[PDB]
Amino acid sequence: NSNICEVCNKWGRLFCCDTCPRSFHEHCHIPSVEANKNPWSCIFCRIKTIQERCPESQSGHQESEVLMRQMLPEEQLKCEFLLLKVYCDSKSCFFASEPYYNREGSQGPQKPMWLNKVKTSLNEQMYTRVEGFVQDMRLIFHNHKEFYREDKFTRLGIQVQDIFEKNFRNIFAIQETS
């Protein structure tokens, strides 16, 4: 196994996957590393199994159809994995915890949103369709763009949004386009 967490790239108290060489801090894995279960298989491995069981699941899809899917167990997992892929980028630090807004010339968003809030909402099964999860993820970055206006810090929102969107297209096998 690796000797650093796959998500935050730090050492510490790590749980090792039985079917691949990745390792995780307990609360870095999503869902949080399960208490018992020997063997244990990480989210990467679980996602690969879905693909392997249904190879056709990698054929192109329309985003509109994906968003209307109900949050059954496999879509729950996919959203968990997509959230984890965002936390994998160090720039997610800026969007992890609850923000506050006091900048001359700007007003805070009407509906603040942050990664840990999305993580809790997934854990508590609050989303009934993929659309709910995707809307809250895109809201994170849209709120940031609007608030930071012409400050160069706006770029951090563009950057992390691009990681989300690339991963969304990959995990949900969105049909490639020009």
Chain contacts with Zn ion (rule: CB under 5 A): 5, 7-8, 17, 20, 25, 28, 42, 44-45, 54
CB 137, CB 144: distance < 8 Å: no
Closest distance of CB 11 from Zn ion, Å: 9
Question: Closest approach of Cβ 122 to Zn ion, in Å?
Answer: 18
Whichever of 10 and 166 has its CB closer to Zn ion, that residue is 10
Are the C-beta atoms of 44 and 22 separated by less than 8 Å? yes
Cα separation, 125 vs 19, whole angstroms: 27
Nearest residue to 70 via CA among 157, 115, 128: 128
Rounded Cα distance between 22 and 96, Å, is 23
What are 57's two structure tokens?
């699941």
CB of 124 to Zn ion, least distance (A): 22
Of 90 and 123, which has the nearer Cβ to Zn ion? 90
The answer to whether residues 43 and 25 touch, using CB atoms and an 8 Å cutoff, is no
Q: Give the single-character DSSP code of 7.
A: T
Map residue 11 onto helix, strand or coil. Answer: coil
Amino acid identity of 27? H
Classify the phi-psi angles of 144: left when phi > 0, otherwise alpha if psi is within -120 to 50, otherwise beta: alpha
CB of 46 to Zn ion, least distance (A): 8
Minimum distance from residue 20 beta carbon to Zn ion (Å): 3
**Minimum distance of Zn ion from residue 13's CB (angstroms):** 10
With respect to Zn ion, which residue has the nearer C-beta, 33 or 42?
42
Q: Which is nearer to Zn ion, 29 or 144 (CB)?
A: 29
- 45 vs 163, beta carbon nearer Zn ion: 45
- Give the residue with the Cβ less far from Zn ion, 67 or 88: 88
